[PDB]
Design a protein around this ligand. Structure first.
Ligand SMILES: NC(=O)c1ccc[n+]([C@@H]2O[C@H](COP(=O)([O-])OP(=O)(O)OC[C@H]3O[C@@H](n4cnc5c(N)ncnc54)[C@H](OP(=O)(O)O)[C@@H]3O)[C@@H](O)[C@H]2O)c1
Ligand SMILES: C[C@H](C(=O)O)c1ccc(-c2ccccc2)c(F)c1
Length: 316
């Protein structure tokens, strides 16, 4: 057994997820070993995406661990994401099918709209013109959503959700005429320096689960993240809590999320830290400790994705 939350479509999501993105300088082979170790350590939720360029490796990890008898498919919750070159409704299913072919899996447990800004279709994930300008595309995301709903009725995605949506774009989906399925989740940046309380409360009021990425302060990959941004895990309050509980600042930051009702992702490709992160289930924070962590909030967003700023759907 393992800790899961009931989604608004009746499916269950493990509350601790394994993040799989690594910057491009890291070989892909590392994804294979890391996901196997994650499963060994007791992660039951694995977070990837087409744009991570690792689904062949992550899929092989999964398959290997099923095939050697370590785990059943039903006890892996696998998430992929629809990249913005495939927002057009007729391209949604083909993108999911392509992911599933790279994975050699029959379905994903969760498929998300990765980012609300659309780009031109084709193989290139960030298509640019000859002058380096991103080739943006105009797509009705409520039509993209209808295409997601059909993927769910086809059984290719057990649940569907979104990522990097703001209040306005969520309302846009939720208020859609003929809506069949609400998003189960909104996967967004969330940590003690950006605790998303307002958006969390909104999602709760709608029974949408907030899934926290960059919960340990992000991969800090340039130029996506500003190197002058504070280092979350160096925070003196988180470090003092860690010392008090004989844990680590990472574990404090992960436990914080669980207790506030957030499903939390954690990426590590280091054997020791993968095993450490599952220790989030071994301790609890008092109300006073949780308040101290609420106090660290500083409106620091690490991932702006501001190369996609300009179009109206840019969410930040
Ligand atoms: N939907 C989106 O738009 C979106 C955006 C960003 C992230 N994500 C997802 O969320 C995942 C996690 O976010 P993120 O990758 O930015 O990284 P994150 O989980 O905040 O982690 C940041 C760093 O923490 C280190 N770390 C992990 N465990 C640690 C521990 N116990 N003690 C100290 N350091 C630790 C890792 O280094 P080591 O590997 O060396 O341990 C990693 O580099 C991604 O992999 C991806 O699956 C989604
Ligand atoms: C933000 C999102 C994520 O981290 O999930 C993400 C991840 C990776 C990319 C990315 C795409 C092309 C080259 C290098 C990185 C990207 F454009 C968006």
């Amino acid at each position: 057994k393992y800790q899961c939350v009931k989604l608004n479509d009746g499916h269950f999501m493990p509350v601790l997820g394994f993040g799989t993105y690594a910057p491009a300088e890291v070989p892909k082979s590392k994804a294979l070993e890391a996901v196997k170790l994650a499963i060994e350590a007791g992660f039951h939720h694995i977070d990837s995406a087409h744009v991570y360029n690792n689904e062949e490796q992550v899929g092989l990890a999964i398959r290997s661990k099923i095939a050697d008898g370590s785990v059943k498919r039903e006890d892996i919750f696998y998430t992929s994401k629809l990249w913005s070159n495939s927002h057009r409704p007729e391209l949604v299913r083909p993108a999911l099918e392509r992911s599933l072919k790279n994975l050699q899996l029959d379905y994903v447990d969760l498929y998300l709209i990765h980012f609300p800004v659309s780009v031109k279709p084709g193989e290139e994930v960030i298509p640019k013109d000859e002058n380096g300008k991103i080739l943006f595309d105009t797509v009705d995301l409520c039509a993209t959503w209808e295409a997601m709903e059909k993927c769910k009725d086809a059984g290719l995605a057990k649940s569907i959700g979104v990522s990097n949506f703001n209040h306005r774009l969520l309302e846009m989906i939720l208020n859609k005429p003929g809506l069949k399925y609400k998003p189960v989740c909104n996967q967004v940046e969330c940590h003690p320096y950006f605790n998303q309380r307002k958006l969390l409360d909104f999602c709760k009021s709608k029974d949408i689960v907030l899934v926290a990425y960059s919960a340990l302060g992000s991969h800090r990959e340039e130029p996506w993240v500003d190197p002058n941004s504070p280092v979350l895990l160096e925070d003196p309050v988180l470090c003092a809590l860690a010392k008090k509980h004989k844990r680590t600042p990472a574990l404090i930051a992960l436990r914080y999320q669980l207790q506030r009702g957030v499903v939390v992702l954690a990426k590590s490709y280091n054997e020791q830290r993968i095993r450490q992160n599952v220790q989030v289930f071994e301790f609890q924070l008092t109300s006073e400790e949780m308040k101290a962590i609420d106090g660290l909030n500083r409106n620091v967003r690490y991932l702006t994705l501001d190369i996609f700023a300009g179009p109206p759907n840019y969410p930040f």
